Amino acid sequence: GTDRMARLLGELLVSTDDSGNLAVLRTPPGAAHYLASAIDRAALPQVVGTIAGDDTILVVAREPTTGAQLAGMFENLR
Amino acid sequence: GTDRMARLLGELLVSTDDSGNLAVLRTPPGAAHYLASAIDRAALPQVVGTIAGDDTILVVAREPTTGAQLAGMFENLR
Amino acid sequence: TDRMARLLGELLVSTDDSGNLAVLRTPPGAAHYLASAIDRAALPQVVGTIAGDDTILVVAREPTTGAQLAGMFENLR
Amino acid sequence: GTDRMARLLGELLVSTDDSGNLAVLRTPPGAAHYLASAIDRAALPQVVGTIAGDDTILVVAREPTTGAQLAGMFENLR
Amino acid sequence: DRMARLLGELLVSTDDSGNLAVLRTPPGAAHYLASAIDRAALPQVVGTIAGDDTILVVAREPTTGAQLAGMFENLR
Amino acid sequence: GGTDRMARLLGELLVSTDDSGNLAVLRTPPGAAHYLASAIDRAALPQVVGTIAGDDTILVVAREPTTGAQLAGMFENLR
Ligand SMILES: NC(=[NH2+])NCCC[C@H](N)C(=O)O
Ligand SMILES: NC(=[NH2+])NCCC[C@H](N)C(=O)O
Ligand SMILES: NC(=[NH2+])NCCC[C@H](N)C(=O)O
Ligand SMILES: NC(=[NH2+])NCCC[C@H](N)C(=O)O
Ligand SMILES: NC(=[NH2+])NCCC[C@H](N)C(=O)O
Ligand SMILES: NC(=[NH2+])NCCC[C@H](N)C(=O)O
Numbered sequence: 001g002t003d004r005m006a007r008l009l010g011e012l013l014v015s016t017d018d019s020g021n022l023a024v025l026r027t028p029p030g031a032a033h034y035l036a037s038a039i040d041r042a043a044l045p046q047v048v049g050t051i052a053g054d055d056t057i058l059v060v061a062r063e064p065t066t067g068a069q070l071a072g073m074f075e076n077l078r
Numbered sequence: 079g080t081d082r083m084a085r086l087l088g089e090l091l092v093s094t095d096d097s098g099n100l101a102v103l104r105t106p107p108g109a110a111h112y113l114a115s116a117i118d119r120a121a122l123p124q125v126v127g128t129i130a131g132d133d134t135i136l137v138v139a140r141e142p143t144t145g146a147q148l149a150g151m152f153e154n155l156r
Numbered sequence: 157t158d159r160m161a162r163l164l165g166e167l168l169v170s171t172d173d174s175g176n177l178a179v180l181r182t183p184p185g186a187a188h189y190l191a192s193a194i195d196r197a198a199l200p201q202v203v204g205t206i207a208g209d210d211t212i213l214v215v216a217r218e219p220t221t222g223a224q225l226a227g228m229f230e231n232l233r
Numbered sequence: 234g235t236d237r238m239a240r241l242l243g244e245l246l247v248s249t250d251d252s253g254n255l256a257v258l259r260t261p262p263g264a265a266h267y268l269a270s271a272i273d274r275a276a277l278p279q280v281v282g283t284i285a286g287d288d289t290i291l292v293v294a295r296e297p298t299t300g301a302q303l304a305g306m307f308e309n310l311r
Numbered sequence: 312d313r314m315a316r317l318l319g320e321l322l323v324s325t326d327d328s329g330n331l332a333v334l335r336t337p338p339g340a341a342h343y344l345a346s347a348i349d350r351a352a353l354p355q356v357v358g359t360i361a362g363d364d365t366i367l368v369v370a371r372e373p374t375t376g377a378q379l380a381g382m383f384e385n386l387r
Numbered sequence: 388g389g390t391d392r393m394a395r396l397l398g399e400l401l402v403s404t405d406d407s408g409n410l411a412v413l414r415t416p417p418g419a420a421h422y423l424a425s426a427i428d429r430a431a432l433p434q435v436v437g438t439i440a441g442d443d444t445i446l447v448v449a450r451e452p453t454t455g456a457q458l459a460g461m462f463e464n465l466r
Contacts, residue, residue, distance in 0.1 A: 017203050019215045020176045021098040024204040029338065030363065030425040033132060033418030033442065040133075048095050049102040051131040053206040054188060054339065054363060054421070055195075058136065058213070060097045099175040107417065108270035108285070108442065111209065111263030118210075126172050127179040129208035132266070132418065132442060136213070138174045166312075183312070184262065185287065185346040188339030188363065207339070209263065209287060250357045252369045253330040254408040257358035266442065273443075281405050282412040284367075284441040286360040287342060288349075291367065293407045293446070326436050328448045329409040333437040362439040363421060364428075367446070 005042040008035055009078040014055075016074050018067035023059040025074060032057050046070055079119035086116040087155040092133075094153045096145035101152060103135040110135050124148060157197035163190050164233035169210075171229050173222030178214040180229065187212050201225065235310070238271035242311035247288075249307050251300030256292040258307060265290050279303060314347040318386045323364075325384040327376035332368040332383060341366050355379060393430040396423050397465040402443075404463040406455035411462060413445040420445050434458065 012035040014026040027035050036052035039059065047070070048060040061070045090113045092104040105113050114130035117137060124143040129136045139148040167190045169181040182190050191207035194214065202225065203215040216225050245268040247259040260268050265285035272283050272292065279298035284291045294303045321344040323335040336344050341361035348359050348368060356379065357369040370379045400423040402414040415423050424440035427447065435458065436448040449458050 017217075019203045019218055021100070022176070022203075022215055024215055026204065028422065028425070030421030030440070034416070034422050036131070037416070037418040048097045048100075049104065049134045051129055051134050051136050051206055052418070053131075053191070053208075056204045056206050058204075058206050058215070060100055060102055060136070062095075063097055099177070106267075106270070108266030111265075111287070112261070112267045114208070115261075115263040126174045126177075127181070127211050127213075129206055129211050129213055130263070138177055138179055138213070140174060183343070183346070185342030185361070189337070189343050192337075192339040209342070252357045252372055254410070255330070255357075255369060257369055259358065269441070281407045281410075282414065282444045282446075284360055284362075284439055284444055284446055286345070286362075289358045289360050291358075291360045291369070291446070293410055293412055295405075296407060328436045328451055331409070331436075331448060333448050335437060360439060362424070362441070365437045365439045367439050367448070 001042045002044070005038040006077040008038045009074060013074060013078050016071040018071040020067055021061045021063070022067040023061060023070035023074065024067070025057040025059060027055050027057065029055050031055065046073065079116060079121070083116040083120040084155050086113050087152060091152065091156040094149040094156065096149040098145055099139045099141070100145040101137040101139065101148035102145075103137060103149075103152060105133050105135065107133045109133070122151075124151070157193065160193040160197040161232045163193045164229060168229060168233055171226040173226045175222055176216045176218070176220075177222040178216065178225035178229065179222070180212040180214060180226075182210055182212065184210045186210070199228075201228075235275045235277070238268075238275045239310040241268055241271050242307065246307065246311055249304040251304040253300055254294045254296070255300040256294065256303035256307065257300075258290040258292060260288050260290065262288050264288070279306070312347065314344075314351040315386055317344055317347045318383060322383065322387050325380040325387075327380040329376055330370045330372070331376040332370065332379040333376070334366040334368060334380075334383060336364050336366065338364050340364065389426075389430045390432075393426040394465045396426045397462055401462065401466050404459040406459040408455055409449045409451070410455040411447040411449065411459035412455075413447060413459075413462060415443050415445065417443050419443065 032052035345361035
């Protein structure tokens, strides 16, 4: 689950950033749903859920984890 | 649109959760847009807006209502 | 960017906000097109956008608020 | 499977039409993915695949079945 | 906003194959243009499906995709 | 590097290929359709008129006289 997700970060994670309770993941064009699917399937305790657009994913942090901490988590796994 | 929304929450709402000012609603795969449409049309006074992904809807709470209080309202129709 | 400004005039139905989020409404189907221009404008106080069908969430960079982003969009339009 | 999809048709199938090897299904706003997921999961031998837009689904007929025949089949299930 | 104004603003290219007109738009515009086409209620259009930058417009028999594509092209 | 990136992603993302008439129908894992279709689009194959992606399906529209079956066989064999 997490392993499959971490593999995909390599190719699919262009950058991370955050604001408040949100991690904002940028992907290549069109890749948001594919990387978001892998994140959802990993069912991280830190993650309430995700919404994918086209090249951006909003990852909603489960309190008290912050978006900045989630962003650092994804960066470390890349 | 409140009654139609309630019917659709009954049919399509798999789970609710929250973080900060956000209620996170899960649906079966592909049903997020149809349910989010029903929510938008209800024009709830404590809802700023919604975005639907594929199986997840972010519903933005209007202060002073929190994501948790919003999710609780939805959950009570699930 | 004024590609963004042109599309705000064309597509921005209304603005609203909550916490660190500006909520932009567009005609049905037009959210991705507006959001693209916003992304391309690369505003310092915008962390990113997610477009649905008729709604865009614009994530404000701390300590900018969603209300402030909303007013900026009204200003550029 | 087909049962499940068939019970959606009263609510989700606004109209059917065809051209060549294609059936064009119209749905309410946002329901295209919701109905198309159900069609995909029915795994009909006369359907090669589907693409959902927002209020339209393109259902691709498996030869020798024509779009018009597929359209009739959905109408007959409704 | 009307198809007849948006075709010029939103079309990158028109092309065709068989019963399909294939329209390309800038990134993210497919649904916005396709909405306009849907609302134009053209007798020779069975329906549209939009992805992100591409729309398939289904020609009503016996109209061909080339005939539809020509119409979209000429109104740009 | 357009065609090579496409060839890589076909192997990684194709679940199955099929066809009907002037269409190749490509199936991907859930959510991967746009990312695969992007690569196809960027490869700009002279026999592909365009593509449309849903969530887990892609239609690739063949340029006449190339058929859906010919494109599908080309895609299948790049896996
Ligand atoms: N080709 C596009 N749709 N571009 C716009 C993307 C808008 C927004 N960043 C999202 O991912 O939802
Ligand atoms: N089949 C898929 N698209 N799965 C991924 C969904 C990603 C995210 N939960 C969303 O709803 O937007
Ligand atoms: N035609 C529709 N898809 N309507 C529902 C829109 C739901 C939500 N406001 C969004 O923009 O994502
Ligand atoms: N609200 C909208 N997205 N409207 C445009 C729909 C375009 C096309 N009929 C489709 O379903 O793909
Ligand atoms: N940014 C993207 N989603 N790019 C891929 C577009 C794929 C296909 N041409 C469509 O419009 O459905
Ligand atoms: N999770 C989903 N959206 N499933 C439905 C997919 C519908 C259709 N096969 C498409 O790709 O457009």
